[PDB]
Design a protein around this ligand. Structure first.
Ligand SMILES: *[C@@H](CC(=O)c1ccc(Br)cc1)c1c(COP(=O)([O-])[O-])cnc(C)c1O
Ligand SMILES: *[C@@H](CC(=O)c1ccc(Br)cc1)c1c(COP(=O)([O-])[O-])cnc(C)c1O
Ligand SMILES: *[C@@H](CC(=O)c1ccc(Br)cc1)c1c(COP(=O)([O-])[O-])cnc(C)c1O
Ligand SMILES: *[C@H](CC(=O)c1ccc(Br)cc1)c1c(COP(=O)([O-])[O-])cnc(C)c1O
Lengths: 318, 319, 322, 322
């Protein structure tokens, strides 16, 4: 829990049971519910040594899971893209994940579901029937990519020059993955040059995405986000739906660096922190330099959707 | 842990594993402890897993001797430096621990992996770089063969991948050994679809790159060439080019076109995982007369001699 | 002997019935160069024009059918936009270009024609010029008989497509395909590969292995009643624009998108489009049949409607004053 | 009026002392087009030549200094090799090309000159021609006064380099930089960026973010006595070849290699080279000084030796018969 300093983001008023060994954090590994200190996987799992895996991360707020159906549908689609047959159904995954959160007692949480090729085979296996895929889960306190004061005041963005986003013809960014070699290089560049977060470009020098977040660009009342070298984010989807509710045209598109610098407003979005403003790029102010009014309406409406009763929410049974 | 090979130049050791030893035939070193394979586990909160923020190397032991251990650990530490990772052990400390690990398994023929990660005490968004706490993990297992023995003798059928290309140096550098195999796995899958044995990937410029776990070498008019850019600087590759120079051939790193691959006199593959083997066809097209060439055969034999003949390439394991 | 008409064997494509005046030295073909209307044999440019030796130029090609120019306004707007993208200031206005081009066609007496308008950086300057004010851009035009990228029997029966493997479309970060240009090094390589492998036309892929375009044409892919065409590594074609408008009028969702090779092979229908020939079907890819290997019904209705739009009085048509 | 000599301010570069005959209509500049020797104002080509509208062509540019052609054999060999790479069969032999080119220079009376030889696919066919035998390739030549990519004072004092960020060199998988070509879309963008950011010349990177080349020149990087130049995304320059030979003669290791931006910034010395100006220093990159910001000693000895090779009797020189 925290006091946020923002009227639209609150936190539950509760205390964790110290008699419960899973309280405040836990994992599900090979059929067992375990505490964080016992949450370990085999070094012989291909999910480690060939990163042969995909995943998704959903969140729980005030005791409700946000867009669980969308999340598990994306996970299973991503698994299909890499020819991975999950050993559980979508319904089974949902039930186990919700149970895991319940055992932690966490009302505000992050829940990761990972599917790997497993430890019963190697990448050179001739017989595809010999592969034995694994599912791993973890539930932890909600994590913030940017702090609360920066959600209010905005963040300073940098366009990376020493690295570009991996092409779809090598390792597809539309498949959520742990292969962050390029994304880590971008973070390191950000430390060197003295900025807060990086945005990468693609092979054609068009806007891609950042480490753990999508970017959105607002110009003359039109709301645009990168369609190609970017994860199809659930937060992004929500942002574009909100934009349409407010009477704006909202579309996926190819966006140039010139268009980024010349934008009315710019924002970032992710399951890990929700929505926040980007007020400058490479030290150049975006319209002056303070969070724009369309961005502010979007941020407020997003957090309303986390609490107002709808089909977007699934109650956790504690 | 042993085989009859059917080849005069590859011979396993004649011995038996002690069944009273719980580490016999396989073991790992994890967070200061020597453990059996079933207890060899790492934290899911290690960044080496969830951001693949790690590098590694794999060396081998043959007839009780580690092969080119110094070169291997030098490459590992160089790769760590390339990704700004400060190892928590020295090169000497790593060598001593790795050799002890093998000794405890009693394996005379083995594969030994040394991995360095960013660790589990921090996250990718950490503001203070001093807060990172890197980890070292090791494992020792029986020697593994990327191709079987009959195929080392008779040759392998290669495929040039069309649905995927090797990750560029401007995204994830192939010259840093890494676990980020998304492209390499796609290539293996394409090989199953099209009915071939192993794949070779191309780079962004449609020049020869490398394969999943191996380098490629191309021989034409007595000149021996291997890809210099989109390829790991292999220790086996290095040995192959040294052997070629010994035999009086010009041996160089270079940019190689697909046309040059199809028109080659000889083609071979190399890796710590299996040594050296011939590639006798590409996309169903024969390389020369479709049988292993004579320069390839001399290289294969000489490689295995170097694994047994007493030299500075060898380091004895104290069993 | 200039060929300027044909019997097509198709009820929806009909040439005009007329004769060229042999007393006219510009009849059947002509050019506009440095203020002068000239015959083809005198249609020459300076080797010192940067439009040649650095290919520092852009262009467009429109057509005339049964005495009417098709979508002239859209064509000249795209040309001027393409010029702006490469920082080239045209020495004529859009209106002036339209007037000169229409006159040129009139002088040829051609009722069915292809008209190319080219803008170059010129011959008064070099690429290393320090003072940008010293550049003196040039406009060149030519008008010729209508040309067909594919023959009439293939418009009816369909064409055999090949996906290129030895070459890829130049990236937007080097030479932008969204700017019409003469820099065809990649496209010519693709054509040569089609001769090697024994196919009729090539389709190139982009850096991400997504569908791009072909030499002188855009590609369109139809699946479960949805009509899609490549948005990135492709010229914003005027024929493409017309095809998508027609699809919407038939009640289909019609969009620009990123399209995979798997999707191409698994398509219900595939077609090609260009000013140079209109619209035609692609019935196989790499020797694999698309559906049952015959032109699909959505494609057929698009082809027929396209040619109807070339004759039915609309704002898409501009009459030539012969 | 025609400028054909200068006082250079440099002891190692000296023009010839002579006067052009004003009775000669080809004096000071001329071209060879379709079998005819013509003056610059009549030097024109057909707009229907594919060398224009599909840039389906390759070329080379050699120079003449103090009445001798420099490395003519190497130049014509590269030209014929480049033609072969794009499946273009030249309509003249290498000997015929040499003889015609030398005659052309002789007719201009120029002792210091630039000579361009171009081979195109021609005007007797189109890119869609089914029968390869129907292609009729053309050769075009021009001879002009020697041209300087950088002025004399900058050869002495050095040039300010910029690494381009808005554009990258066309990949070998689209349009090959190892085939000399007129397809300069990326190179022109780089020049434009140089005007925007306030620098003198640009250097482009390749797809892997490694050093490529510049517009009309190769780059060379010197570090701890080792001399290196980009091997992949770069023309195999004749000037580059000469520079590396000179480096070996001075006792330096001289090699083609993959070079990173970090290595460029950290270099002891950096230089540029081309037929169009010879050799010159690069003293800063993106406003950052290379070493102490003045031309390095290895660079200076290379520059001087290059110009010695242009005058000292050797097999590198072919005399023009005036
Ligand atoms: C390393 C691949 C291996 O080390 C390995 C080990 C066991 C097996 Br069954 C398969 C592969 C590798 C190389 C080889 O370089 P070196 O000879 O080990 O120094 C080459 N290229 C890639 C991409 C690799 O991963
Ligand atoms: C334009 C190509 C042509 O206009 C053309 C003209 C005549 C012939 Br015989 C062949 C080609 C082009 C397009 C499509 O242009 P639009 O649909 O007519 O506006 C698409 N892609 C490329 C690369 C082109 O050059
Ligand atoms: C060749 C460029 C030239 O030939 C040239 C001639 C005159 C002028 Br003012 C400018 C340029 C070129 C090279 C260098 O090749 P070489 O050393 O002359 O054999 C390198 N890279 C490119 C892209 C070129 O065009
Ligand atoms: C995944 C982002 C996360 O799941 C995540 C988890 C914890 C933290 Br502290 C930060 C981020 C991801 C996204 C997110 O899109 P979505 O809105 O969660 O669907 C976007 N882009 C990339 C590359 C990601 O990895």
């Amino acid at each position: 829990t925290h006091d946020t300093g923002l009227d639209y983001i609150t936190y539950s008023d509760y205390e964790l049971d110290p008699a419960n060994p899973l309280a405040g954090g836990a994992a599900w590994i090979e059929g067992a519910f375990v505490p964080p200190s016992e949450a370990r996987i085999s070094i012989f799992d291909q999910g480690f040594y060939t990163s042969d895996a995909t995943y998704t991360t959903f969140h729980v707020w005030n005791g409700n899971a946000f867009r669980l159906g969308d999340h598990i549908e994306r996970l299973f689609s991503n698994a299909e893209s890499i020819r991975l047959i999950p050993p559980l159904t979508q319904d089974e995954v949902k039930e186990i994940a919700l149970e895991l959160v319940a055992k932690t007692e966490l009302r505000e949480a992050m829940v990761t579901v990972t599917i790997t090729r497993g430890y019963s085979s190697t990448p050179f296996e001739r017989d595809i029937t010999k592969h034995r895929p694994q599912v791993y889960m973890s539930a932890c306190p909600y994590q913030w990519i940017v702090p609360f004061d920066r959600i209010r005041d905005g963040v300073h963005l940098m366009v990376a020059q020493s690295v570009r986003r991996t092409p779809r013809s090598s390792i597809d960014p539309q498949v959520k993955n742990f292969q962050w070699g390029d994304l880590i290089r971008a973070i390191q560049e950000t430390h060197d040059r003295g900025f807060e977060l990086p945005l990468l470009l693609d092979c054609d020098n068009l806007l891609a995405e950042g480490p753990g977040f999508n970017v959105v660009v607002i110009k003359d009342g039109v709301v645009r986000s990168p369609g190609r070298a970017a994860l199809p984010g659930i937060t992004r989807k929500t942002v574009l739906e909100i934009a349409e509710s407010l009477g704006h045209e909202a579309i996926l598109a190819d966006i140039t660096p010139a268009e980024l610098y010349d934008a009315d407003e710019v924002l970032g979005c992710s399951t890990g922190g929700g929505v926040w403003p980007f007020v400058s790029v490479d030290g150049n102010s975006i319209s002056d330099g303070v969070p724009g009014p369309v961005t502010q309406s979007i941020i407020r409406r997003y957090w309303e959707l986390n609490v107002e009763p709808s089909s977007l929410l699934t109650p956790v049974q504690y």
